[PDB]
């Protein structure tokens, strides 16, 4: 059992900055006869299958940008990204194939950027869902930064927290922002007993919440 230890667990830099990550094996990966270190580096972007960038510890795979360099021999290896690009957001894993195969625990690369306020939009329940006796109000908080945000729901001006589900997307490879969804689900009779529905988003980008709302009987 060759153990692969990767460090650090996570990293973060603004685009254009350099980063390195280390991978250490419990046994030499250098092959006497071939003269090659059987150590590869994989890039796994959110939602994608892993992708090989470097093999034999320093040979870039065909088509991989030159900003990706691998180094080391024996037991200690390093992958360097000379100038982090927004699309480089990913979890990187090292893997030895000296004896069987084993993956490191990975290193997550996050991108730093300028704070950005979310673009908020609220949606009343669809007529189709109401027919099923349910009624979910949906609010989308799109393209903000940092990832840290607060959403508060109000019905008839009174805060509500039971029946809320929030989900955040991984960082954006386009603009390094985050987006998130907040759903408030009620029973249709619940929904019809009230009239004002509000979604409030408080982000560091402002002490004043971005407020979106609708009235059930609006025109």
């Amino acid at each position: 059992d060759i153990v692969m230890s990767q460090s650090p667990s996570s990293l973060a830099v603004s685009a254009g900055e350099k980063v390195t990550m280390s991978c250490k094996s419990s046994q030499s990966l250098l092959n006497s006869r071939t003269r090659k270190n059987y150590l590869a580096w994989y890039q796994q972007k959110p939602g994608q299958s892993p992708k090989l960038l470097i093999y034999w510890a320093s040979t870039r795979e065909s088509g991989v940008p030159d900003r990706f360099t691998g180094s080391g021999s024996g037991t200690d290896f390093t992958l360097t990204i000379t100038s982090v690009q927004a699309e480089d957001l990913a979890v990187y894993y090292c893997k030895q194939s000296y004896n069987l195969r084993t993956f490191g625990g990975g290193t997550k690369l996050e991108i730093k950027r300028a704070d950005a306020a979310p673009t908020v939009s609220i949606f009343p329940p669809s007529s189709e869902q109401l027919t099923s006796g349910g009624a979910s109000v949906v609010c989308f908080l799109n393209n903000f930064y940092p990832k840290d945000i607060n959403v508060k729901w109000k019905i008839d001006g009174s805060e509500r927290q039971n029946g809320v589900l929030n989900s955040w997307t991984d960082q954006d490879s386009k603009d390094s922002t985050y987006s998130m969804s907040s759903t408030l689900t009620l029973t249709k009779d619940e929904y019809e007993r009230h009239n004002s529905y509000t979604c409030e988003a408080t982000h560091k980008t402002s002490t004043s919440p971005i407020v979106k709302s609708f009235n059930r009987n609006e025109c």
Partner: protein, 222 residues
């Protein structure tokens, strides 16, 4: 064209067994080792084992974690890889990937399938309800308009969501599913020019493999 497609994933109960498949194309299946790697949600990749090429007798090796529980074989005529999983348990729930392996000696490879999600559980398979999210009769702002799709109450994961059959890609944010009781709910937002919707058609396409279901929900105004 080198391609690897895994299938056979889905829902299976504890102690149950399951057989995954991986169809390969674009290369000489015959003389290539093939590996299975899995990945629990939000976790690290874990190698499970491989099956060598003919030049090496089509022999197999496994990791201690799957010792005497999983089996790897390859139907060389079909040119297809398989993974027999037995006595499964919650900890086995993950995405299983097949990959074209060989041995550093050779310089090439780097091919993985998109992977198949296996969920070990007792809960019942349930198809999703797909609801259109259009702006309230309210007076929305912007020369742009954001629409949505609420995919509610399904099990197990996953669900695939596309807009206008993939033609609408730029401007799509699909949020990770969240579990409530034994049911998942996810949503997907798309933003388009006000001059394009509702004058043009905008449809949310949802597939739910485990229940073999496909729904196309058109988003209409008002």
């Amino acid at each position: 064209e080198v391609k690897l497609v895994e299938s056979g994933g889905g829902l299976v109960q504890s102690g149950g067994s399951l057989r995954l498949s991986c169809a390969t194309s674009g290369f000489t299946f015959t003389d290539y080792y093939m590996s299975w790697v899995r990945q629990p949600p939000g976790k690290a990749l874990e190698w499970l084992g491989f099956i060598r090429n003919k030049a090496n007798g089509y022999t197999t090796e496994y990791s201690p974690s799957v010792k005497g529980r999983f089996t790897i074989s390859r139907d060389n005529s079909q040119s297809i890889l398989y993974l027999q999983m037995n006595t499964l348990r919650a900890e086995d729930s993950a995405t299983y990937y097949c990959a074209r392996d060989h041995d550093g000696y050779y310089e090439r490879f780097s091919y993985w399938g998109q992977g198949t999600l296996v969920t070990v559980s007792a809960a019942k398979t349930t198809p999703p309800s797909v609801y259109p999210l259009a702006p309230g009769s309210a007076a929305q702002t912007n020369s742009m308009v954001t629409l949505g799709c609420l995919v509610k109450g399904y099990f197990p994961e996953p669900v695939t969501v596309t807009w206008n059959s993939g033609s609408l890609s730029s401007g799509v944010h699909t949020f990770p599913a969240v579990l409530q009781s034994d049911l998942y709910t996810l949503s997907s937002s798309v933003t388009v020019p006000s001059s394009t919707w509702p004058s043009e058609t905008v449809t949310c396409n949802v597939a739910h493999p485990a229940s073999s279901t496909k729904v196309d929900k058109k988003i209409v105004p008002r």
